[PDB]
Coordinates of C-alpha atoms in Angstrom, one line a residue:
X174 CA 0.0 0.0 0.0
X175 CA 1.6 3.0 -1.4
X176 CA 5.6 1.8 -0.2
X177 CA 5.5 2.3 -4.6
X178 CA 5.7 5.5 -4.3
X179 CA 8.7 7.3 -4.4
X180 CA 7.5 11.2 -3.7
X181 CA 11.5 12.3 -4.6
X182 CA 13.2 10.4 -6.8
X183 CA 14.6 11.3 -10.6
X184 CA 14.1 9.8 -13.6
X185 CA 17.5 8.6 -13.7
X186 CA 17.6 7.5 -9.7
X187 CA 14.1 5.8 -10.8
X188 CA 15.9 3.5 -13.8
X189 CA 18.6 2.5 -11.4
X190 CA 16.6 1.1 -8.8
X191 CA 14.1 -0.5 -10.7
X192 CA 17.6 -2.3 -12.6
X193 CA 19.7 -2.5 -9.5
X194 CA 16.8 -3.7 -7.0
X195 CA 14.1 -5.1 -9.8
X196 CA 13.7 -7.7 -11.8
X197 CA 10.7 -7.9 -14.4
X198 CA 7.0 -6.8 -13.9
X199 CA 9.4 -4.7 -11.2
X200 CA 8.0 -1.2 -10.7
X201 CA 7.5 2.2 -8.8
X202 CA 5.5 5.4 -9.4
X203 CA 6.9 8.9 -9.0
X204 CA 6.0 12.9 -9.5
X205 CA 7.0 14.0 -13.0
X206 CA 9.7 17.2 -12.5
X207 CA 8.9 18.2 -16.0
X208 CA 5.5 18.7 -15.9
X209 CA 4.1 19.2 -12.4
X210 CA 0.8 17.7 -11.3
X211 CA 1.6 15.2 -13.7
X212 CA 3.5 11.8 -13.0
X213 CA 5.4 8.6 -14.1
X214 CA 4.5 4.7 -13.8
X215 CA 8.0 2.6 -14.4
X216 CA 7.5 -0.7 -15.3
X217 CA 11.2 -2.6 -15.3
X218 CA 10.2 -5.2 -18.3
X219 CA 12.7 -7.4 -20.3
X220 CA 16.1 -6.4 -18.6
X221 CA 15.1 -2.6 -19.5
X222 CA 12.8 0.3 -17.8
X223 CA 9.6 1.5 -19.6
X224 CA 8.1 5.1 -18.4
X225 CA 4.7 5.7 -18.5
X226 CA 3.0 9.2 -18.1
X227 CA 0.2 10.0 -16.3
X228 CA -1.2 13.0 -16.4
X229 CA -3.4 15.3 -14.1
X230 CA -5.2 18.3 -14.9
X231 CA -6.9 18.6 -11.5
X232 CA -10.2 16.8 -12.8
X233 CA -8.6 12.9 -12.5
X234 CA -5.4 10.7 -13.1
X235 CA -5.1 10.1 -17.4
X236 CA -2.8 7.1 -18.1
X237 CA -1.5 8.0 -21.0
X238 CA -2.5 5.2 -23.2
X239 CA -4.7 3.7 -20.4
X240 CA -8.1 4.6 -18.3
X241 CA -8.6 7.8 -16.1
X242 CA -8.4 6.8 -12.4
X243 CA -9.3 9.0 -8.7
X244 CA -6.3 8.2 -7.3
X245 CA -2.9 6.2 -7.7
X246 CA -3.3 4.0 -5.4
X247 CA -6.7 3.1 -7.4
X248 CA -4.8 3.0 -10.4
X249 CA -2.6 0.5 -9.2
X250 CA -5.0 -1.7 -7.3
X251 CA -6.8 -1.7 -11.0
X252 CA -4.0 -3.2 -13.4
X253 CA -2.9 -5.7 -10.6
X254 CA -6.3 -7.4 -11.5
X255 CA -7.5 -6.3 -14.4
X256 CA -4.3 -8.0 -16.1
X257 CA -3.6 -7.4 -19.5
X258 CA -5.0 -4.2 -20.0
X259 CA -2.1 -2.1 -19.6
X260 CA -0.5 -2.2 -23.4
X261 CA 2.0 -0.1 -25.0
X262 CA 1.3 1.1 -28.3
X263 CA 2.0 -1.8 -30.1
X264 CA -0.1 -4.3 -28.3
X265 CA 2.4 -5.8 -25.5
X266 CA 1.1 -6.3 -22.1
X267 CA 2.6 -4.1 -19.1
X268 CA 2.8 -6.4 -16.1
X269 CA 2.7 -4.6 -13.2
X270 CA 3.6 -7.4 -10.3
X271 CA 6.6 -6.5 -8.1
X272 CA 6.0 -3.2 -5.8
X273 CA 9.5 -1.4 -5.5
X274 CA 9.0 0.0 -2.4
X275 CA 10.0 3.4 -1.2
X276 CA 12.3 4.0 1.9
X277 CA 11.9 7.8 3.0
X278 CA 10.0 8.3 6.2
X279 CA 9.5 11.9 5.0
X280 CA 5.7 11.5 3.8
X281 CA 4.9 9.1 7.2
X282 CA 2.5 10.9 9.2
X283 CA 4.6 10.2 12.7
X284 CA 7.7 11.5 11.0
X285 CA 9.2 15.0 11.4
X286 CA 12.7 15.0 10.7
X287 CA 14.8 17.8 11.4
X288 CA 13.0 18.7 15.1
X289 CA 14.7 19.5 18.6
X290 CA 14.1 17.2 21.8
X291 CA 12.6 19.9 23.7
X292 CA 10.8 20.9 21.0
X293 CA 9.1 17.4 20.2
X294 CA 8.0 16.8 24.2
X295 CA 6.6 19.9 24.7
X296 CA 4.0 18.9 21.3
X297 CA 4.0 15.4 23.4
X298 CA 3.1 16.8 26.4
X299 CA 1.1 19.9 25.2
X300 CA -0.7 18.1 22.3
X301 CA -0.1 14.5 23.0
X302 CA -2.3 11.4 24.6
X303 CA -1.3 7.5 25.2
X304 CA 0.6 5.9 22.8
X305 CA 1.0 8.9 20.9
X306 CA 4.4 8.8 19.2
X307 CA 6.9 10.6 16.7
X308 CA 10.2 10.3 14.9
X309 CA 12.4 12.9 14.3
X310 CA 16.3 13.3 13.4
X311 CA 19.1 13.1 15.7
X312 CA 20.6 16.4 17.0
X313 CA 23.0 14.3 19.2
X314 CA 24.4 11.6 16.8
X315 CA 23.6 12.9 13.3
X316 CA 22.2 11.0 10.9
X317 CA 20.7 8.8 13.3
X318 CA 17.1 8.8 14.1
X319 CA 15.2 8.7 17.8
X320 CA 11.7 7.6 18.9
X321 CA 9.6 9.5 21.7
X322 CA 6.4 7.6 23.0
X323 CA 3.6 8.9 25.4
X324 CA 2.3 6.6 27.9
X325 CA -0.3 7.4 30.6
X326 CA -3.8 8.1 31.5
X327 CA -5.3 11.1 29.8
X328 CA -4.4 14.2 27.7
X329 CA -2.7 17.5 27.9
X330 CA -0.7 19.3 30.3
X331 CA -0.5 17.2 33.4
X332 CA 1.1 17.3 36.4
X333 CA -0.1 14.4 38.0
X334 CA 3.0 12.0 37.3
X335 CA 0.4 9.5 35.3
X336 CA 2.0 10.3 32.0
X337 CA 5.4 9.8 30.9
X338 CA 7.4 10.5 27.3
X339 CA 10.3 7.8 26.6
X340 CA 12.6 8.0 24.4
X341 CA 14.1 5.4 21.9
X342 CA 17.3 6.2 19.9
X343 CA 17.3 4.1 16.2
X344 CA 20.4 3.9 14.7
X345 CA 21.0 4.1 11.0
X346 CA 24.2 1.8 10.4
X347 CA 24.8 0.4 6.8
X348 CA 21.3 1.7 5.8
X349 CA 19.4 -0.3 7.9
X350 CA 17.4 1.1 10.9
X351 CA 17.5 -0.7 14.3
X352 CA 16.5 -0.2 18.2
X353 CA 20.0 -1.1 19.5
X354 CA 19.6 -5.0 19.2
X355 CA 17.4 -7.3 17.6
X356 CA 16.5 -7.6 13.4
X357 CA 17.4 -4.8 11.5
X358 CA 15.2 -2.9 9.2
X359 CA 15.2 -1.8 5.9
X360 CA 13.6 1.3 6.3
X361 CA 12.0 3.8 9.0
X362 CA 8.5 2.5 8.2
X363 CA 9.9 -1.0 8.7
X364 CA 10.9 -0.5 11.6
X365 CA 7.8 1.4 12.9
X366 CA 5.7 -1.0 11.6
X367 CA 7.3 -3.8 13.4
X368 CA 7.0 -2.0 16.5
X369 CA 3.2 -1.6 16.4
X370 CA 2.6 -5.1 16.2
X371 CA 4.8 -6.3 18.7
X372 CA 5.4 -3.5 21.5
X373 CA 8.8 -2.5 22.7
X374 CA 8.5 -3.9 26.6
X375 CA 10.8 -1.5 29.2
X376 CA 12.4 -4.0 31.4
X377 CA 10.0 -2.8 34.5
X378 CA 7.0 -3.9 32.1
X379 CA 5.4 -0.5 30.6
X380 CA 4.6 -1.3 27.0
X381 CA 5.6 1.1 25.2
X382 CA 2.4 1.3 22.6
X383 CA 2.5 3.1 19.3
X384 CA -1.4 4.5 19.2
X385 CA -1.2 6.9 16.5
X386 CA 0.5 10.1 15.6
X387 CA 1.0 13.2 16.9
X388 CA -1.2 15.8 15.1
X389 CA 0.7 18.6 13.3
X390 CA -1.6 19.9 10.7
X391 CA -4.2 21.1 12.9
X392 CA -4.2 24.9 13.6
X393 CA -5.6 27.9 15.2
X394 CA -7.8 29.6 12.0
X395 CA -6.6 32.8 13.3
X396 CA -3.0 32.0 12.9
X397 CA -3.1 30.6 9.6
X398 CA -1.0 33.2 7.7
X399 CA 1.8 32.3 10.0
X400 CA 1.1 28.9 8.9
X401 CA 1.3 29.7 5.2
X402 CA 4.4 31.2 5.6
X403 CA 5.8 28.5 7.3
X404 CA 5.2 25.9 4.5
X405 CA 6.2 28.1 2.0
X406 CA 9.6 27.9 2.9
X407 CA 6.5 22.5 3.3
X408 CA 3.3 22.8 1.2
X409 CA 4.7 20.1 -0.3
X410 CA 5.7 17.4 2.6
X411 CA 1.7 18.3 3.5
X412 CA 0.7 17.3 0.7
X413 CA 2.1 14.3 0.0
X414 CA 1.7 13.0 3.6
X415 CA -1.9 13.5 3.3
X416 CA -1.3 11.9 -0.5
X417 CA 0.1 8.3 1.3
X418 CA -3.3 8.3 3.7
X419 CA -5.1 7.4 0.3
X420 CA -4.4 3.7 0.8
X421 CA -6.7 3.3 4.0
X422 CA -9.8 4.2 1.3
X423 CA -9.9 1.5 -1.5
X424 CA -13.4 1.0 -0.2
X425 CA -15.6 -0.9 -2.8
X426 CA -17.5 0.1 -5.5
X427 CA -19.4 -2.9 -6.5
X428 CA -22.7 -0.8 -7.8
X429 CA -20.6 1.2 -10.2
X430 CA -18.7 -1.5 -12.0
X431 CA -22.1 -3.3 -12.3
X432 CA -22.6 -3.9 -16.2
X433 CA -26.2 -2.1 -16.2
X434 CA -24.3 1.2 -14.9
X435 CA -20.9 1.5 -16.8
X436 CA -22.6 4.2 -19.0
X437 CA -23.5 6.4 -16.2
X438 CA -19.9 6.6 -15.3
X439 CA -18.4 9.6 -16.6
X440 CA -15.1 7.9 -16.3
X441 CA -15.5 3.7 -16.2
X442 CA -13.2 4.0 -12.9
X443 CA -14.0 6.8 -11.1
X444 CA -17.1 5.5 -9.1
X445 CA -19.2 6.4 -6.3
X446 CA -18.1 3.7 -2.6
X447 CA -21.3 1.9 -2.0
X448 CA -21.5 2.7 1.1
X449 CA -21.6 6.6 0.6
X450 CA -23.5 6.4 -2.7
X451 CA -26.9 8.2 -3.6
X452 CA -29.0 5.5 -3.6
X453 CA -32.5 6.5 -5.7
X454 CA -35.3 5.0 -4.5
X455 CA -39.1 5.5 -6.1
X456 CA -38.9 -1.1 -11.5
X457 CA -36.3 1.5 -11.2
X458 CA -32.6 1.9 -11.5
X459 CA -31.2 3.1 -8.3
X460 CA -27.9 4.2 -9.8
X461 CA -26.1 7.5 -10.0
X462 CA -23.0 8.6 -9.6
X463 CA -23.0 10.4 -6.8
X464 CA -22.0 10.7 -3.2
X465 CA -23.2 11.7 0.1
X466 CA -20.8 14.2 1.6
X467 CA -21.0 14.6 5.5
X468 CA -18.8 16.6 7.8
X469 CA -17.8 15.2 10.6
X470 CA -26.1 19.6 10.1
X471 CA -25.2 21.0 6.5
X472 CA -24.3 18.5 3.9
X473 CA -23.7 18.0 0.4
X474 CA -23.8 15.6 -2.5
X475 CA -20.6 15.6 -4.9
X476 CA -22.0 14.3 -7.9
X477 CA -20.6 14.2 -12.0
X478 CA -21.6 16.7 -14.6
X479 CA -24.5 15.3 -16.6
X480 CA -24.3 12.8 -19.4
X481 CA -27.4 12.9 -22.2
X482 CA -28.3 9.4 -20.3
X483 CA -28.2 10.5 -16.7
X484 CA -29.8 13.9 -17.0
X485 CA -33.1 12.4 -15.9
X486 CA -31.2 10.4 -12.7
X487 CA -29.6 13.3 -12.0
X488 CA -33.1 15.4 -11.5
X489 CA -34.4 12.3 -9.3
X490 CA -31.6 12.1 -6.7
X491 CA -32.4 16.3 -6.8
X492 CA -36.0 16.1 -5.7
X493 CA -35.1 12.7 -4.3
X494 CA -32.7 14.5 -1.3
X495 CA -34.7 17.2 -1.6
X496 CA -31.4 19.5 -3.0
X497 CA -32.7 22.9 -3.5
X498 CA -29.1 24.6 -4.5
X499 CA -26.9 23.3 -7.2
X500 CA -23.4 24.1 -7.7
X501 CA -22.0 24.1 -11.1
X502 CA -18.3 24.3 -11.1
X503 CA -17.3 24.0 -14.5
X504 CA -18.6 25.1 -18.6
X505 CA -19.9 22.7 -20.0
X506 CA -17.2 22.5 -22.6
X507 CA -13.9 23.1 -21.3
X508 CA -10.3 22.4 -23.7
X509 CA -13.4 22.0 -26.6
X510 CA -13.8 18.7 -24.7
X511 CA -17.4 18.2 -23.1
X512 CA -17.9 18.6 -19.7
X513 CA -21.3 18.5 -18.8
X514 CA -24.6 18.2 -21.0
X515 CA -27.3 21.2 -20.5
X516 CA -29.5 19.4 -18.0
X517 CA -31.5 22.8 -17.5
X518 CA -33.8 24.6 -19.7
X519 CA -33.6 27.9 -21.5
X520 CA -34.2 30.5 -19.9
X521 CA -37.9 31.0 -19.5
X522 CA -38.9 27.4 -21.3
X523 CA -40.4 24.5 -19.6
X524 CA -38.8 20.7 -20.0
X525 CA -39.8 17.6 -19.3
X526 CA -37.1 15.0 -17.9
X527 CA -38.5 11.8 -17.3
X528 CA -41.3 12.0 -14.4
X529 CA -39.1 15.5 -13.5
X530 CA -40.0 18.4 -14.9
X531 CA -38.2 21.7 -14.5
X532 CA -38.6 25.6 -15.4
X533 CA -36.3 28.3 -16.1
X534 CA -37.8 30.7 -14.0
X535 CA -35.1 33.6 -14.4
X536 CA -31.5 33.9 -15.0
X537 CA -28.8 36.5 -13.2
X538 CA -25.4 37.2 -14.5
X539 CA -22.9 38.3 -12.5
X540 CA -18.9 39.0 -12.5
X541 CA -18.1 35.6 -11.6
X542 CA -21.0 33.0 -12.3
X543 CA -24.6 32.9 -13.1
X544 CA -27.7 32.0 -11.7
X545 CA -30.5 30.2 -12.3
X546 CA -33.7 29.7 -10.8
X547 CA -35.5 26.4 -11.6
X548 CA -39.2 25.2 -10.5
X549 CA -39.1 21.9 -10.1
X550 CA -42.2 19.1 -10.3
X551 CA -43.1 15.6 -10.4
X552 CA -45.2 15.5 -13.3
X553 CA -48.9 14.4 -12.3
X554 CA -49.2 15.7 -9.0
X555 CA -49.3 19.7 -9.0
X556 CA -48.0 20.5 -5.7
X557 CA -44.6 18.7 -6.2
X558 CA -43.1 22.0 -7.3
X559 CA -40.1 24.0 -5.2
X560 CA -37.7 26.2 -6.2
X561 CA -34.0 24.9 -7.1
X562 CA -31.3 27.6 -7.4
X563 CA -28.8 26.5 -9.8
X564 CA -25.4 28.2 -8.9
X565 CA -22.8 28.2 -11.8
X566 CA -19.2 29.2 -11.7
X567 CA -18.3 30.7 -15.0
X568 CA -14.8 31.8 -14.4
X569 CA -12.9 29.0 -13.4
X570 CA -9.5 28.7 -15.9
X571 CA -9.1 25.6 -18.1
X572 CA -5.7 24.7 -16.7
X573 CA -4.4 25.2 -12.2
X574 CA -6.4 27.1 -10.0
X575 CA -7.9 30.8 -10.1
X576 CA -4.8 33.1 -8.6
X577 CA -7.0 35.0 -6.4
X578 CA -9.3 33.0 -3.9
X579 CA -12.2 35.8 -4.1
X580 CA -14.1 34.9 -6.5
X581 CA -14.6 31.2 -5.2
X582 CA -15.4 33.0 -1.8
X583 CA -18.0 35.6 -2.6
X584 CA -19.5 32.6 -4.5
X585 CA -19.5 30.3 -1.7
X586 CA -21.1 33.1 0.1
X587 CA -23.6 33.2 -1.5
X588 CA -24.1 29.9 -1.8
X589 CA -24.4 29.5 1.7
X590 CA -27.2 32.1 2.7
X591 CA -29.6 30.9 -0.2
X592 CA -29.3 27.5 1.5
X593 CA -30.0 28.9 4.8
X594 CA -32.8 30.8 3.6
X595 CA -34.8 27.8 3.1
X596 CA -35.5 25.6 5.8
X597 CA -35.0 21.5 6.0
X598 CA -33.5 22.2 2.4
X599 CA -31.4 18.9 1.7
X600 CA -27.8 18.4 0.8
X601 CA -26.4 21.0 -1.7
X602 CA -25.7 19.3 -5.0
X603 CA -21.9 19.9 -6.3
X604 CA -20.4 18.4 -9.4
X605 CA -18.1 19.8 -11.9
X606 CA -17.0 17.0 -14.7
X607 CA -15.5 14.0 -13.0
X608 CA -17.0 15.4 -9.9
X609 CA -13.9 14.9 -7.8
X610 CA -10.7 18.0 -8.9
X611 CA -12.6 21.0 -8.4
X612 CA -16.1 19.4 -6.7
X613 CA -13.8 18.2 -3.6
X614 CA -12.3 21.6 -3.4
X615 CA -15.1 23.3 -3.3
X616 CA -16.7 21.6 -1.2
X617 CA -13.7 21.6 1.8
X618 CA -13.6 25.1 1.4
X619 CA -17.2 25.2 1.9
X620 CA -16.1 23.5 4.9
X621 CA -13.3 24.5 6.5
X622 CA -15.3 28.5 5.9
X623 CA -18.6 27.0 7.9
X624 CA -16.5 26.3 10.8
X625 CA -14.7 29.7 10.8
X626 CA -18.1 31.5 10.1
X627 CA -19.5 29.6 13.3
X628 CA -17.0 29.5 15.7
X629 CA -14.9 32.2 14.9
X630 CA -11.6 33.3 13.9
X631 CA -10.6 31.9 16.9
X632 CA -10.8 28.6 16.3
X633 CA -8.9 25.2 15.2
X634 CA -8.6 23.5 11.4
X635 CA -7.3 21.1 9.9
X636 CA -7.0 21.1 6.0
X637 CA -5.0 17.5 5.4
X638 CA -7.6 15.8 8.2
X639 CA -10.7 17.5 6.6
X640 CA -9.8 16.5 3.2
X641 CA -8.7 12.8 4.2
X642 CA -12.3 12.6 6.1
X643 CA -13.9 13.6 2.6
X644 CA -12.2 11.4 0.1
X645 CA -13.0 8.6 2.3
X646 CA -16.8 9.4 1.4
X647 CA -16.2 10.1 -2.4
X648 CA -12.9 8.5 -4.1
X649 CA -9.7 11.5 -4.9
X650 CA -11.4 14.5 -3.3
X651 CA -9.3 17.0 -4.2
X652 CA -7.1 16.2 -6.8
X653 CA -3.9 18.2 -6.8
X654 CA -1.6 20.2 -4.9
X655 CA -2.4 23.4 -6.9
X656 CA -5.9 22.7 -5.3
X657 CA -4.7 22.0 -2.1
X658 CA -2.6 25.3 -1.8
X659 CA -5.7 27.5 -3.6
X660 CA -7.6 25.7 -0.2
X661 CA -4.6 27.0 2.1
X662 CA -5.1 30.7 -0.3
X663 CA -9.0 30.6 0.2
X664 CA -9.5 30.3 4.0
X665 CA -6.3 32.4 4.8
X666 CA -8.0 35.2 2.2
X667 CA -11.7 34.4 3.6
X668 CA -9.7 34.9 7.6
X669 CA -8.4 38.3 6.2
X670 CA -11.4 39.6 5.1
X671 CA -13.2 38.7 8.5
X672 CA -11.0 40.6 10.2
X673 CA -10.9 43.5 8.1

């Protein structure tokens, strides 16, 4: 699970390994330095290295000369199982069977790295609880590594002598890690790994336990330019810590690979977990692709843009979840490649989709989006009809992220007080094309910016932990670091504007 990732490596480091370490059907993934965003599967086959790109343009992963995947890790998980199907042009099959597995720590959530003693058992003590742990660098003997463990009773600042930190000290020697006696390990994970399963035991008895992390993401809203500074020397170890979480979440997706649905998939692979899916109720289909989003009162569904098949599902799940604000994130032709099919009316002109039936009540333009106000109705029964405001964002840019977060904010804004206008409205309908890049973004802003607009300036976030509790309710939630960053840019810019 994701040990095939190797987050710094080059090109020319990545041939070595996979000829020095590998063998055949031998490979590794990696972050393209050419073109960032975009990455690099390398597949050692017949005594030589084969690269092949993958590309993404914050919607989804494109295998270049393959199928558009959510994430890596699905990608991967795919073609070890759907054997065969990775070809190079001219027919031969890509095996991909041995994982090369990484050995930097760096993107481990319970590594730091460069960090002080004092400075590590004060976040212990301060922020720490039992079994919380961390691994950080060696001040005294460089290159060396050490291990600090809580163990106690409860959590914070206490004086009470129930709680203890210990320290281990892991020596690297010959490139491989160890505790000062026993098996030696091949990497810092290794070792860590071990160590969960089978307990270090201090000769008086405590066990010393490794529970989870210490968090380090989470932060003060009202601090967070301090925070953007710091990570824009870090940005970048954020990210692709949170990026190596996406292995817990290869939940199934049984519904969406079912034959009867493969042409309500936008993208054949990119598919809705069963057990987060929209599931439509009142001989039916009951498929859509479409998730439930939940923090964790307000909620929202992050859906696809329409297909010309799906429009009529996608206005049952709407008066289904009785959605009564639609965000549109994207045109619906974008790179002169279609993104979404018109699944609203003209302005002023009545449709009919399926037992749905929706009006174009009025339209609004304005500097960043437009508006629309929709009537909806079962047909039949004349008092099925409320109102469905269909939000759309006109001025998102084909390629990266807008440069200036306001836009997405006064938008969002917006958004929010039209859905608090009307009472026991349902979840608020986002989808851009793919439903993932841009939908996921939104919708964490949307987020991260309720919490804020509740409790304050003066009060904790977490961007990595939000967006890791969202993707494991809709597959690749966010798709790229430019996206992630924009996230950072939006609630820092959305803080400043409070307070101003």
């Amino acid at each position: 699970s994701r040990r095939w990732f190797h987050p710094n490596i080059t090109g020319v480091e990545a041939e070595n390994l996979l000829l020095t370490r590998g063998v055949d059907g031998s490979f590794l993934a990696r972050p393209s330095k050419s073109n960032p965003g975009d990455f690099t599967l390398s597949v050692r086959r017949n005594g030589a290295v084969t690269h092949i790109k993958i590309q993404n343009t914050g919607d989804y992963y494109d295998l270049y000369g393959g199928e558009k995947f959510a994430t890596l890790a699905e990608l991967v998980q795919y073609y070890m199982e759907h054997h065969g199907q990775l070809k190079e042009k001219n027919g031969d099959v890509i095996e991909l069977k041995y994982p090369l597995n990484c050995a930097d720590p760096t993107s481990e959530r319970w590594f730091h790295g460069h960090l002080s003693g004092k400075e590590a058992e004060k976040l212990l003590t301060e922020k720490g609880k039992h079994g919380s742990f961390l691994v950080r660098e060696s001040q005294s003997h460089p290159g060396d590594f050490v291990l600090s463990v809580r163990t106690g009773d409860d959590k914070g600042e206490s004086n009470d002598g129930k709680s203890k930190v210990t320290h281990v000290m892991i020596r690297c020697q010959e490139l491989k890690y160890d505790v000062g006696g026993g098996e030696r390990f091949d990497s810092l994970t290794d070792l860590v790994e071990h160590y969960k399963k089978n307990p270090m035991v201090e000769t008086l008895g405590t066990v010393l336990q490794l529970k989870q992390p210490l968090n380090t993401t989470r932060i003060n809203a009202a601090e967070i330019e301090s925070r953007v500074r710091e990570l824009s020397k870090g940005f970048w170890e954020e990210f692709e810590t949170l990026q190596q979480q996406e292995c817990k979440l290869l939940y199934s997706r049984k519904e969406g690979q079912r034959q009867e649905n493969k042409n309500k998939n936008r993208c054949k692979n990119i598919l809705p977990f069963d057990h987060t899916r929209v599931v439509l109720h009142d001989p039916v289909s009951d498929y859509i692709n479409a998730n439930i989003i939940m923090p964790e009162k307000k909620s929202y569904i992050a859906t696809q843009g329409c297909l010309q098949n799906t429009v009529n599902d996608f206005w049952r799940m709407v008066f289904q979840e009785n959605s009564r604000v639609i965000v549109m994130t994207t045109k619906e032709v974008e790179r002169g490649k279609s993104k979404c099919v018109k699944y609203w009316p003209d302005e002023y002109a009545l449709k009919e989709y399926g037992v749905m039936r929706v009006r174009n009540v009025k339209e609004s333009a304005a500097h960043d989006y437009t508006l629309r106000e929709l009537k909806l109705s079962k047909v039949g029964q004349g008092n099925t009809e409320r109102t469905v405001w269909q939000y759309h964002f006109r001025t998102w840019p084909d390629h990266g992220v807008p440069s200036d977060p306001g836009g997405v904010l006064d938008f969002l804004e917006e958004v929010h007080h039209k859905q608090e206008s009307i009472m026991d409205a349902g979840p608020v309908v986002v989808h851009c094309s793919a439903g993932i890049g841009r939908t996921g973004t939104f919708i964490v802003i949307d987020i991260l910016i309720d919490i804020i607009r509740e409790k304050g300036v003066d009060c904790d976030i977490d961007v990595p932990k939000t967006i890791q509790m969202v993707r494991s309710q809709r597959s690749g939630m966010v798709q790229t670091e430019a996206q992630y960053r924009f996230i950072y840019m939006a609630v820092q810019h959305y803080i400043e504007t409070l307070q101003r």
